[PDB]
Design an enzyme around this catalytic site. Structure first.
Site, PDB file in Angstrom:
ATOM      1  CG  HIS A  30       2.952   5.950   5.813  1.00 12.30           C
ATOM      2  ND1 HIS A  30       2.544   5.615   7.144  1.00 12.30           N
ATOM      3  CD2 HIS A  30       1.846   6.579   5.309  1.00 12.30           C
ATOM      4  CE1 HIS A  30       1.428   6.259   7.357  1.00 12.30           C
ATOM      5  NE2 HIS A  30       0.806   6.686   6.109  1.00 12.30           N
ATOM      6  CD  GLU A  56      -4.042   9.673   2.631  1.00  7.80           C
ATOM      7  OE1 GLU A  56      -3.692   9.384   3.946  1.00  7.80           O
ATOM      8  OE2 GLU A  56      -4.593   8.586   1.945  1.00  7.80           O
ATOM      9  CG  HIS A  68      -0.688   8.382   1.772  1.00  5.56           C
ATOM     10  ND1 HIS A  68      -1.704   7.407   1.738  1.00  5.56           N
ATOM     11  CD2 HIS A  68      -0.500   8.761   3.105  1.00  5.56           C
ATOM     12  CE1 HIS A  68      -1.591   7.071   3.082  1.00  5.56           C
ATOM     13  NE2 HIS A  68      -1.089   7.922   3.614  1.00  5.56           N
ATOM     14  CB  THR A  76      -5.970   8.200   5.490  1.00 11.12           C
ATOM     15  OG1 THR A  76      -4.634   7.558   5.266  1.00 11.12           O
ATOM     16  CG2 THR A  76      -6.046   9.632   6.332  1.00 11.12           C
ATOM     17  CG  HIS A 116      -1.783  -1.169   1.341  1.00 11.07           C
ATOM     18  ND1 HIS A 116      -2.690  -1.612   0.424  1.00 11.07           N
ATOM     19  CD2 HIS A 116      -1.921  -1.951   2.387  1.00 11.07           C
ATOM     20  CE1 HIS A 116      -3.419  -2.401   0.585  1.00 11.07           C
ATOM     21  NE2 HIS A 116      -2.987  -2.911   2.055  1.00 11.07           N
TER      22      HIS A 116
HETATM   23  C1  LIG Z   1      -0.129  -0.867  11.219  1.00 10.67           C
HETATM   24  O1  LIG Z   1      -1.189  -0.549  11.145  1.00 10.67           O
HETATM   25  C2  LIG Z   1      -1.829   0.633  10.345  1.00 10.67           C
HETATM   26  C3  LIG Z   1      -0.904   1.987  10.794  1.00 10.67           C
HETATM   27  C4  LIG Z   1      -1.337   3.023   9.983  1.00 10.67           C
HETATM   28  C5  LIG Z   1      -2.629   3.001   8.951  1.00 10.67           C
HETATM   29  C6  LIG Z   1      -3.166   1.898   8.904  1.00 10.67           C
HETATM   30  C7  LIG Z   1      -2.910   0.669   9.632  1.00 10.67           C
HETATM   31  O2  LIG Z   1      -3.498  -0.394   9.294  1.00 10.67           O
HETATM   32  C8  LIG Z   1      -3.937  -0.688   7.912  1.00 10.67           C
HETATM   33  C9  LIG Z   1      -2.708   4.023   8.046  1.00 10.67           C
HETATM   34  N1  LIG Z   1      -2.392   5.303   8.993  1.00 10.67           N
HETATM   35  S1  LIG Z   1      -2.542   7.008   8.342  1.00 10.67           S
HETATM   36  N2  LIG Z   1      -2.540   7.040   6.764  1.00 10.67           N
HETATM   37  O3  LIG Z   1      -1.296   7.792   8.882  1.00 10.67           O
HETATM   38  O4  LIG Z   1      -3.961   7.320   8.879  1.00 10.67           O
HETATM   39  C10 LIG Z   1      -1.194   5.343  10.175  1.00 10.67           C
HETATM   40  C11 LIG Z   1      -0.435   4.314  10.244  1.00 10.67           C
HETATM   41 ZN   LIG Z   2      -0.955   7.724   5.688  1.00  9.87          ZN
END
Ligand SMILES: COc1cc2c(cc1OC)CN(S(N)(=O)=O)CC2
Ligand SMILES: [Zn+2]
Ligand SMILES: COc1cc2c(cc1OC)CN(S(N)(=O)=O)CC2
EC number: 4.2.1.1
Length: 259
Positions: A93, A105, A95, A197, A63
């Site tokens: 990370h 975002e 986007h 998100t 992702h």
């Molecule tokens: C490890 O588990 C997760 C951690 C994170 C996200 C989603 C996860 O599970 C899918 C997405 N966010 S974000 N984009 O900053 O809202 C933060 C970090």
């Molecule tokens: Zn994010």
């Protein structure tokens, strides 16, 4: 379950079917309407203390890519601003888009940036990340916009390791990376209560979005766009446009740290 993503058939518009909270009351990201955000004198100064940050590994999770930190002690923390208590850095990370005109975002007066960095922190009072995401004040994510212009020197070490994690499931050692090199000069920010998100879209995040974008080069973001959503030995799906669009603000006010 298995297969949410960012394609035409499993993208943000489909997530609600498995994660109904997708249509909830405090979803992220949002558009930041700069003229409607209100300066808040009650906000305390923001404190980013990353001098002892211990990076460990960089992971392509299909992702995005995550730079992971040792969060077994208070080595890198975020405090102050809207936050009560101490939030520990666990990972960052990005986007980003397929083109420089999209990728972020959050948006600002409907403007999209080329990318958006998320520095993810969890509230230490909840003991671990998995517990924290079940709490309305469990996470604080520091969001930083990227625009295309001059190169960001502090990003280059990330860029240069991406070739080693091209496909889903690949990881590489990524020690001794200092995330302070990713910050802009000003820590002026907007803040509002929101959500993860990506699925599971839990409504557990205090969002802190910096006003000042960092500049990165075309060459740097072009290398982000050479990553793959797919695993090794699968047909190539470039990792691009891994952003959720702005969601309804509903009953929320965005607060500004600055006049
Ligand atoms: C490890 O588990 C997760 C951690 C994170 C996200 C989603 C996860 O599970 C899918 C997405 N966010 S974000 N984009 O900053 O809202 C933060 C970090
Ligand atoms: Zn994010
Ligand atoms: C197996 O084929 C599919 C599986 C899934 C989706 C769409 C598919 O066809 C493209 C969308 N969901 S979702 N609601 O975005 O989480 C996850 C599972």
């Amino acid at each position: 379950s298995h297969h949410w993503g960012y394609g035409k058939h499993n993208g943000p518009e489909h997530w609600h079917k498995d994660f109904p909270i997708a249509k909830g009351e405090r979803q992220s990201p949002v558009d930041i309407d700069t003229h409607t955000a209100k300066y808040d004198p009650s906000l305390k100064p923001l404190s980013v203390s990353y001098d002892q940050a211990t990076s460990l590994r960089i992971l392509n999770n299909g992702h995005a890519f995550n730079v992971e930190f040792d969060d077994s002690q208070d080595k890198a923390v975020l405090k102050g601003g809207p936050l009560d208590g101490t939030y520990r850095l666990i990972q960052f990370h990005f986007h980003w888009g397929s083109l420089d005109g999209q990728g972020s975002e959050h948006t600002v007066d409907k403007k999209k940036y080329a990318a958006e960095l998320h520095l993810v922190h969890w509230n230490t009072k909840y003991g671990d990340f998995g517990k924290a995401v079940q709490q309305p004040d469990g996470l604080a994510v520091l969001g930083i916009f990227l625009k295309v212009g001059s190169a960001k020197p502090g990003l280059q070490k990330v860029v240069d390791v991406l070739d080693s994690i091209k496909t889903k499931g690949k990881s590489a050692d990524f020690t001794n990376f200092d995330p302070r090199g990713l910050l802009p000069e000003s820590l002026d920010y907007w803040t509002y209560p929101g959500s993860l998100t990506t699925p599971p879209l839990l409504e557990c995040v205090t969002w802190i979005v910096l006003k000042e974008p960092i500049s990165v080069s075309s060459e740097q973001v072009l290398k982000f766009r050479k990553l793959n959503f797919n695993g090794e030995g699968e047909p190539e799906e470039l990792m691009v446009d891994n952003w959720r669009p702005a969601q309804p603000l509903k009953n929320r006010q965005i607060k500004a740290s600055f006049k």
